[PDB]
């Protein structure tokens, strides 16, 4: 087996509170309404985000003149805790990105995204991914979301990022965060199926061969 996901992180700083941008909750809601009928697609959304993070790390390392490290995407299920977790070893998120990325669309203007979603020229799931709000689909299956991220940028600290998706998120420095991003989803009462290894395998195997870097489920290679 080849696993990297474990409960290694430790809170080692006090908590900073951040309120959602005014429109962010509206956009969270519209993603959830759009994707409910195929709610399992959140896994593909987060794998796509992880792949994007690995590509960003690739280009950093190409310009740095350095080797490619273990560049992987890992899924973990925990039926006892009612969680699904995804961890990538990609570029990770800086403090500034953890503060600002959720509200990017709200701040820059949602018109283009909402127009695209309305026109339905492609699958809603694809549009949502393309506009960079695939992470919004984490919330639609979660009672709460628990994120650990550390940027590959020099001097970057590791952070815990928590939210129940309602209107606030909280950031605290953490020790033991691997470069990249880990997202722990505490699943909603109607979404417990995604804490089943068999169910997640069934869902992901339909597209796992389309993933460029090694993809693992509970330590087992999927591609």
Ligand X SMILES: Nc1nc(Cl)c2nc(O)n(Cc3cc4c(cc3Br)OCO4)c2n1
Rounded Cα distance between 194 and 157, Å, is 31
Among 30, 43, 47, 50, binds ligand X (CB under 6 A): 50
Number of amino acids touching ligand X (CB under 6 A): 16
Stretch 53-72: interaction string toward ligand X, x if CB under 6 A: x-------------------
To ligand X, the closest distance from the beta carbon of 86 in angstroms equals 7
Residue 146, classed as helix, strand or coil, is strand
CA quadruple 92, 94, 100, 104: dihedral sign? negative
Residue 18, classed as helix, strand or coil, is strand
Q: Does 45 bind ligand X (CB under 6 A)?
A: no
- 49 among annotated binding-site residues: yes
Q: Does 89 bind ligand X (CB under 6 A)?
A: no
Angle, CA of 177, 211 and 209, to the nearest 5°: 135
Q: Does 20 bind ligand X (CB under 6 A)?
A: no
Per the DSSP assignment, residues forming a β-bridge with 73 are 88, 215
* Segment interacting with ligand X (CB under 6 A) among 23-31, 89-97, 121-129, 206-214: 89-97
Residue 219, classed as helix, strand or coil, is coil
The footprint of ligand X (CB under 6 A) covers 49-50, 53, 88, 90-93, 97-98, 101-102, 135, 147, 161, 181
């Amino acid at each position: 087996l080849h696993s990297i996901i474990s409960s290694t992180e430790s809170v080692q700083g006090s908590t900073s509170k951040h309120e959602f941008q005014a429109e962010t909750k509206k956009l969270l809601d519209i993603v959830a309404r759009s994707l409910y009928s195929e709610k399992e697609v959140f896994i593909r959304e987060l794998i796509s985000n992880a792949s994007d993070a690995l590509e960003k790390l690739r280009h950093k390392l190409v310009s740095d003149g350095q080797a490619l490290p273990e560049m992987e995407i890992h899924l973990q299920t925990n039926a006892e805790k009612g969680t699904i977790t995804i961890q990538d070893t990609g570029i990770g998120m800086t403090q500034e990105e953890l503060v600002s990325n959720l509200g990017t669309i709200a701040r820059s203007g949602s018109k283009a995204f909402l127009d695209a979603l309305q026109n339905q020229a492609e699958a809603s799931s694809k549009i949502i991914g393309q506009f960079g709000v695939g992470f919004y689909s984490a919330f639609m299956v979660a009672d709460r979301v628990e994120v650990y991220s550390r940027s590959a940028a020099p001097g970057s600290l590791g952070y815990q990022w928590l939210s129940d998706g309602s209107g606030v998120f909280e950031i605290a420095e953490a020790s033991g965060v691997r470069t990249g991003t880990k997202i722990i989803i505490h699943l909603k009462s109607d979404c417990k199926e995604f804490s089943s290894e068999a169910r997640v395998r069934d869902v992901v195997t339909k597209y796992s061969n389309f993933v460029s870097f090694p993809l693992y489920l509970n330590g087992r290679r999927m591609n």
